[PDB]
Design a protein that fits this description.
The chain has helices spanning 16-24, 51-54, 64-70, 89-102, 121-130, 157-170, 180-202, 214-221, 237-242, 255-264, 277-284, 286-295, 328-353, 386-395, and strands at 8-13, 33-37, 45-49, 75-78, 81-82, 85-86, 108-110, 115-119, 144-146, 206-211, 229-231, 313-318, 325-327, 355-356, 359-366, 375-380, 408-421, 424-425. By secondary structure, it is an alpha+beta fold. The longest helix is centred in the C-terminal third of the chain and has 26 residues, at 328-353. Bound molecules: 2'-deoxyinosine 5'-triphosphate and calcium ion. The protein binds a DNA duplex (11 and 8 nucleotides) through strand 3, strand 6, strand 12 and strand 16. A 2'-deoxyribonucleoside 5'-triphosphate binds at residue 60.
Length: 426
DNA sequence: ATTCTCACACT
DNA sequence: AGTGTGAG
């Protein structure tokens, strides 16, 4: 009822794509470097930045050319392109390396290519018996921060982390195997081993957050990045939330979180607490207001889905500006290339994960429209065959063509999207 | 001119 | 089925 039933962790690879390239290209280790795609336009678009390049101001979405302006010594690894489009195979396969290690300790929800939530509730219960009732040495937690500690009556980072960890472990009630703080602590000892196993078995370093739910875990993980883990206890939530901007909380990063700020006239997550649940529901709907009411008291029940494998496999490409596709055979040729990349990933999925997709979603964007997708249409995926898929995807879109000429496409297409869905056992 | 995934609520 | 939001 105080949102302390579970022990949940979120593990997040540090500058992941960069690390995959650094393990592979030793010359890039401990240097400012980014991973780019499409070198031709403004040197390439940056999709990942090491921590040494972040110190210079280089960010994602920046053009490599522009990053070179902020950081002249910046080293670049460019993504493999296949069929004219960026190919992430290398990163997906490094990701499977980690997911399989993590999955030896507890059941995982894959959250992205490089983050995963862990429910440690049963594992913690198993260790709490094996541990008799003996103290938890600080040597079990060599990279753990305790959020909100030290407090009360050293000038270097490692000095502060130790003191906070000392105070936490001192006031720790190791005789009471049902106290939620002691469970987080044992969750944190498990994440330490999990993280040591990941770095040993892959060379990949990661940060992690430990708390009682997914949202507090995600936030905690970002508090002491890179290569560290943060425990956030229920007790720390009032002070943590009291100056936490609303947009930092997962799902509040967008238009909803902006309405909360404007409608309620607040800036910080802790300001939500003064409102009744019914007031929050009248403003944002039953589900959103219920969710906010509990979340601002550190309580959320969205759980760790037992799911390590994506649910849709999709292939898309943007054609911005003067590169928009304007002729029918252009559209035909790119749909083919997408279906091919899509085929290559579907058959690898059928062999590894014992399933087949059964519906083909095709989406397109017309020059002049506003939104991610202009139009969605679907059809049957019966055969993993690139030429049928592209033939079928064209068929279910050819009548979007406002043009009167057969050979031309108007309005020209600025995005093409093919997505396999509705998997079944095989 | 970032681009590219993937998930889910609502209808 | 098709649209819209959110996040990595
Ligand atoms: O806006 C984005 N547009 C396209 N792709 C994106 C975007 N944002 C994240 N991604 C994908 C690829 C990225 O390599 C991976 C890791 O994302 P993410 O955890 O936010 O950053 P990161 O691992 O590169 O470094 P860090 O964790 O230290 O912030 O997610
Ligand atoms: Ca990351």
């Amino acid at each position: 009822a105080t949102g302390q039933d579970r022990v949940v962790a979120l593990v997040d690879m540090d500058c992941f794509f960069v690390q995959v390239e650094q393990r592979q290209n030793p010359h890039l280790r401990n240097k400012p470097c980014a991973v780019v795609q499409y070198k031709s336009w403004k040197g390439g678009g940056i999709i990942a930045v090491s921590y040494e390049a972040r110190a210079f101001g280089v960010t994602r979405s920046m053009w490599a050319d522009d990053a070179k302006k902020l950081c002249p010594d910046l080293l670049l690894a460019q993504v493999r392109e296949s069929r004219g489009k960026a190919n992430l195979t290398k990163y997906r396969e490094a990701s499977v390396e980690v997911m399989e290690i993590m999955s030896r300790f507890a059941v995982i929800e894959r959250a992205s290519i490089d983050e995963a939530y862990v429910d440690l509730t049963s594992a913690v219960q198993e260790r709490l018996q094996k541990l008799q009732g003996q103290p938890i040495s600080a040597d079990l937690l060599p990279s753990t921060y305790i959020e909100g500690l030290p407090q009360g009556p050293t000038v270097q980072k490692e000095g502060m982390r130790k003191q906070g960890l000392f105070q936490w472990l001192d006031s720790l009630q190791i005789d009471n195997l049902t106290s939620p703080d002691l469970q987080l602590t044992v969750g944190a000892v498990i994440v330490e081993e999990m993280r040591a196993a990941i770095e040993r078995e892959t060379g990949f370093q990661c940060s992690a957050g430990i708390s009682h739910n997914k949202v507090l875990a995600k936030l905690a993980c970002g508090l002491n990045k890179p290569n560290r883990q943060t425990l956030v206890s229920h007790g720390s939530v009032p002070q943590l939330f009291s100056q936490m901007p609303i947009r930092k909380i997962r799902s509040l990063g967008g238009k909803l979180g902006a309405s909360v700020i404007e409608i309620l006239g607040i800036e910080y997550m802790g300001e939500l607490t003064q409102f009744t649940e019914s007031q929050l529901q009248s403003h944002f709907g039953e589900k959103n207001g219920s969710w906010l009411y509990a979340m601002c008291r550190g309580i959320e029940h969205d759980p760790v889905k037992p799911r390590q494998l994506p649910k849709t496999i999709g292939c898309s490409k943007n054609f911005p500006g003067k590169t928009a596709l304007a002729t029918r055979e252009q559209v035909q040729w790119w749909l083919l290339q997408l279906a091919q990349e899509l085929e290559e990933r579907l058959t690898k999925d059928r062999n590894d994960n014992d399933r087949v997709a059964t519906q083909l979603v095709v989406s397109i964007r017309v020059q002049g429209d506003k939104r991610l997708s202009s139009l969605r249409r679907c059809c049957a995926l019966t055969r993993y065959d690139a030429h049928k898929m592209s033939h079928d995807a064209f068929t279910v879109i050819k009548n979007c063509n406002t043009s009167g000429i057969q050979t031309e496409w108007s309005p020209p297409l600025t995005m093409l999207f093919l997505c396999a869905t509705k998997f079944s056992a095989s």
